[PDB]
Structures are given as structure tokens and as C-alpha cells.
């Protein structure tokens, strides 16, 4: 229900939480043929079968991806300039597919 | 205090040290091995990458 959902929100309307109570795996975003790009920088690429978190995502949405080279950290373009500002204190990892 | 003698004015390049090894070393042993350290996944037949 989280990754195969129907319709997206606005880009600025997200959930201020992190995932909870789960067998974190990192496996599907690498091995599934639907996924192409997944770059984790500050965290090891296989490090969720021991890592662990507190609050809880329910990010259940899918959106058109025709803005590939602008939906990325530290970028400018037609999307993350107004109506949604990327923070100075972003901490996390990005999937692209 | 010895900044002046074992230091070339154009650079002393003849002193080496090991920065990569699969295992921590033993007290007062001598390792002369020059095998290429394995960091990633695929091996080399004498190439880079």
C-alpha cells in the first residue's frame, strides 16, 4: 500500500516521519527490475538489516517523473525552486527509476 | 628532533607504508607481501578499477 499506491499529493505535502516497526531490508530497491538509481551516501548501501528508526512513514503515492534531472538533492530547476524548497539540512537517501 | 636530515629539499620519496590490508598485523613480524588489496567485488588480472 506504500509503494504501489494510486495518486500523488502535492510535492510540498509529505510526511514529517521516518519508517517504524519493520524488517528494514534495502533489498527491493536494488534487486527489483523497476528500480534503476539508488545512491546512499552517508549510510552504507546494505545497512538496514541492523539499522533501526523511530517515527513512521506512510508515503503512499506515485507521480509522473518527467523532471528527472531536477528532482535530486542540491539542485535547481523548474520544480524545487518555488512552492517547495529543498532544505539546507537534508539527511537521507534518494531513489530514481 | 630531526626535521633536517632525512628530508630532501625537493621531496623525500623513498619511505613507504601500508594503508590497506585484509587483516591486522602481529607483534614483531615482518610482512614483505605485495599482493593487491581487495576492496570492491571483482578481481584484477593486473589491471586497475
Amino acid at each position, epitope marked *: 500500500e506504500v509503494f504501489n499506491a494510486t495518486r500523488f499529493a502535492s510535492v510540498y505535502a509529505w510526511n514529517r516521519k521516518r519508517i517504524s516497526n519493520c524488517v528494514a531490508d534495502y533489498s527491493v530497491l536494488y534487486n527489483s527490475a523497476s528500480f534503476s538509481t539508488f545512491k546512499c551516501y552517508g549510510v552504507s548501501p546494505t545497512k538496514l538489516n541492523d539499522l533501526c528508526f523511530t517515527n513512521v512513514y506512510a508515503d503512499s503515492f506515485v507521480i509522473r517523473g518527467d523532471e528527472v*534531472r*531536477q528532482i535530486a538533492p542540491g539542485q535547481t530547476g523548474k520544480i524545487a525552486d518555488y512552492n517547495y524548497k529543498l532544505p539546507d539540512d537534508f539527511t537521507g537517501c534518494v531513489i530514481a527509476w | 628532533n630531526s626535521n633536517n636530515l632525512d628530508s630532501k629539499v625537493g621531496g623525500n*620519496y623513498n619511505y613507504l607504508y601500508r594503508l590497506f590490508r585484509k587483516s591486522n598485523l602481529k607483534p614483531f613480524e615482518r610482512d614483505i607481501s605485495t599482493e593487491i588489496y581487495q576492496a570492491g567485488s571483482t578481481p584484477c588480472n593486473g589491471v*586497475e578499477g
Partner: antibody
Amino acid sequence: QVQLVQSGAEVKKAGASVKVSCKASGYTFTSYDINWVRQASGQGLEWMGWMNPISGNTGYAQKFQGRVTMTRNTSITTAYMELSSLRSEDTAVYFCARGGRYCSSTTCYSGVGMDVWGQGTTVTVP
Amino acid sequence: VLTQPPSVSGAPGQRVTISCTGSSSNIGAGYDVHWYHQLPGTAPKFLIYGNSNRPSGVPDRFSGSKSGTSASLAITRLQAEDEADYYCQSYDSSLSGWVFGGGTKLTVL
């Protein structure tokens, strides 16, 4: 703190060989992965050889295989890419390369040639 | 080798993008792709390494990403002050260490 000097404009003949040097001295060479990329007149750049400046780890180009010899002088901090068996179609403009990536890390990152060597051409005309 | 739009024209304005297309073994591991800035009259000091990270010499106009089987870039307006040939340097792993591409020249009108 990067200094990079190649040879000058020359002229050679087919069947000969050039023992070309690509000279630098005066910083920590061990931290960098020295590449070797050439170019052509009006055509793109293509890479030939690579250098780990410690103990001379060796790798050759497939396009210029059997006619290439790679050697270095770590005593004077010098690397060679000896272009052996010069040809008739050798008429082009070649370059060295160098890395500036800090290769004390395990990852095979791209070499940061934020300086590139000067100028060279192994032209062979009659 | 790797296909890309080789010659362009531009004046200042709003963003324009580039790609550099490789195969699956080339585009899969070749995320170290970057573009040799060969400006007229200087050494090929590339001004872009490892996509989005830079040495000194360019503003934040240029973007770095990977696009399926294509190694992609996004300018904020390919324009009249940026005369420079580019290439694409993908770390090809099982193939040669890095094989270059079509050679998109960022150029002027």
C-alpha cells in the same frame, strides 16, 4: 600545487620510435591516480594508459596494444608512456593525463585532472 | 562511441539538457561520468567531475544525473558565454576502464 609539462612540436618518420617523457616533480604523487588520455585534430579524446605511482602497476590500451611500453621513474618522480613503433597514420596531437583524486579511498573514482599537461604531437610526414 | 547531440547553438535564457548514451554494462557502473571542458586555447581542464561536484571555474548552472541507458546533464541555458567541447567518461568496469562518447560541444551563436 600541480606542475605539468610535456614535450614540444616535433616531426618523425614511420617505423621509428619515440622515447617520450612526461615530466613533473614537487608534490605527493602517491595520492593521485595518473591517467593517460590523448586527443586528435578535430576528433574526440580517447584514453590509453593508467599509472599507480608506487611500484609501477601496469595496464595497456587495447587499441595500441603490442606497440606500447609503460615505465616510470619513482626515484625522480617521473612517469613514461613510451610510444614505440611510430607509424604513418601517427599524424595527430596527443596528450598525457593526470589524476587528482585522493586515492587513499577504496572506491575507484574518476581522476581529477584539474590541470592537464601542455602540448605534444607525434606527427609523421615525408 | 557513446551517442549524444554533437553540435548545438544557444543564447541566454531557460534550461537545456544533454545526455550521453551507453549500454547496460556501460551505464550501470559508469556513474563516474563527467564532461571534459576543452575550452578553445586552454588545457582540457574539465570543470565537472563525478556529475554534480565541481572544481573552480563554473557556476551551479550544470546538473548531473543518470538517465536509464544515458549519462545525462542539465544546463541552465546552453548559451553564448560557454564555448566548450564536452565528452562523457563512464567507468565501464568489465570493458575498458573508460570509453568516451559522441562529444557534445557546448557552443555559442
